[PDB]
Amino acid sequence: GPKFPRVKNWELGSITYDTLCAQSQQDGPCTPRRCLGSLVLPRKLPPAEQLLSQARDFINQYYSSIKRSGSQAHEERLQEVEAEVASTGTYHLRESELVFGAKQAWRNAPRCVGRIQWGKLQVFDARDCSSAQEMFTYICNHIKYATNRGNLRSAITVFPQRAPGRGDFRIWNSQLVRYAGYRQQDGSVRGDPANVEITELCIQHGWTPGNGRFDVLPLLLQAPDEAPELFVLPPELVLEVPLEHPTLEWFAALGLRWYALPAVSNMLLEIGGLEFSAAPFSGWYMSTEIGTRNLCDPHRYNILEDVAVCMDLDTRTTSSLWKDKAAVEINLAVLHSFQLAKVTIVDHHAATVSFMKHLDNEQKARGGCPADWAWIVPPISGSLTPVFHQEMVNYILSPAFRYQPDPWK
């Protein structure tokens, strides 16, 4: 009936219609002829006709959230954003506006299953930062605050925006905490295979390696129109959790571990047409990210076999589900270890349940929620999760967090 997408939950039988997608101002990669919903990346790599359009949209969005849409303040602010843009080609956001955009960005992130927390975000303004040494100080303050000795707090630090005729502020690392990936002579990799390239760039910019499997990397912080600079994170700020299993004594002997703080640092924060090329954000890990992807992906630590081997499992055949049995124990070890270390973490069952709650909330608040099924469903025990059975509608909303081309090349 309704001229809007009908989404069904196959478990509860319930139905809803998405009206939120109508506000989308950015096109996706799908077409009536073919769905490219599975692709990780759409496919690629500041005027007034178009910037002004995005700014007002954002401004309306903001006045509407404080329930003062169409008021005097609203009208004046609009006039104001046109004034600044016409005489300079760009414009600045108010503090309160920045806090709103940041939270909306997380809120709008289709791939994030932890959005029930979108409201509890600590925004740190660092739009006043003017050097790499300053970027590094903000960053450590961020980590200290977010880590909070185990009781993690979601936070984002927003550095200065882009301005034509000038280089952006950038963090070369994909995360604030990454383990080194050392290419070996035999062609293998010591450390995290994912970070081979960033590890190599650090060594070039004067960093001295170390053949460990979990050596925290330095940060390559870049201030406008200047070569990056190396900064070593003070060990005491980087909280880590050595891994051990609740009943398998040998697990601890594997010498495995992981850091508590998941802080993405390479994405672009876009608000009202403004681009914050450096805006690291952090929350707390969902156990499957560590115990399934980071540790079990063939191209990552790839430990399944090592673990199935201690378990005395028939690794000679797929039908023995050795891979499945091993992955579960590994995921359990991660959960047992964080809880043992009093470091915040959420399992995939709890996360997905709370994500379903988030959907209902969003339905009443915005009439919908952009969600990327393939990312909302956990990497293990997919259908044992409630979100598996939930049909989702994916679209692009702003404010948004987006991908941006790497600094180097």
Added chain:
Amino acid sequence: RPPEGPKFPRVKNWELGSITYDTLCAQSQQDGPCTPRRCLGSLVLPRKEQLLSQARDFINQYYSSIKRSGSQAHEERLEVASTGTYHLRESELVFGAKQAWRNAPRCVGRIQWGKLQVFDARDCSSAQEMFTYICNHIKYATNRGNLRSAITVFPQRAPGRGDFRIWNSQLVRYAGYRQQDGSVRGDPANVEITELCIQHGWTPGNGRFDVLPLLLQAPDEAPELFVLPPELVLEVPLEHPTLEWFAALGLRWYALPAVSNMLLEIGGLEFSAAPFSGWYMSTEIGTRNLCDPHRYNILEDVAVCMDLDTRTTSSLWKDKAAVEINLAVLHSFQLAKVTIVDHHAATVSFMKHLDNEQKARGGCPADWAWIVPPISGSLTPVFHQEMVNYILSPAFRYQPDPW
């Protein structure tokens, strides 16, 4: 080296770093549900002269396949005239059926598409005749445990009269008896079909695994009940390799997965009743059929028996229990000598299939959410493979229930 842009979509594999481009989607003639505004790829069902063309495309396609295109025949072949419709030759039907399966985006078992036994039953005119055909289909495909892929095609649709239909969603499914308190004895998924069977005069059972009778319908007539010969339905008692008490659960499952409620579309013609079968992927039984909250829902029970801590999610009792149930299935089928493939082998073979199809047609339509299995998603190779989804003809599609 690779198209960039939207024309031919680049597809990447994140485990290997390999990249390819899909040129096959250009042959799509049917729009899906996605828009540049919002992707609806996760929905399960569509919100919801032309013929003469759909049927030349098929004929060309068929003639190009036998390496005999643009000749005399193909040309000569390209009834709609004085009838408004037309009929396919048998060899053409076999080719079309094989292609429908080949183009199914949600089937991870497509490595097997060339190996399909096609049964032509377009000459049925009674529910009775459908039954005999179906019985022979089950027998052939089961082949005493060494399962064979098979499809039986019934009379196409004729604009004007009713459709030949098989009311059941599957040729073999277990009855679901509701029984005041509000619980189901059997398969909750089959309450409706069970009730309809009783309504149509079937004497119910009183078991957790009573095989359901078939409700077969010839055009414009009320369906007719038929009871499958017990000797025809090969089942498999479930038990675990080490958990001795598992067999005590008294669980079991049938060996043959035969879909019967879909519509087969070939060259514009629609075959409303075309049951098709293959063999199971262990996780369909062990995860969906047995663990799903609205199916046999044995998850908790098994966890408690295993003495897991079901008080908190964090103990991962659901995860552990699910794996053991999946293993039980694989163990039971192997022990019983009945064909079946685990999600690891099937997806490994599907990856091969993708390579093949790339050399063969420059791509392969695939639905990621369905290719990746319901458990252990990222421990499977397909998880890290990007996929393109679009519709090709021939194709299998949903149709409304006959009631």
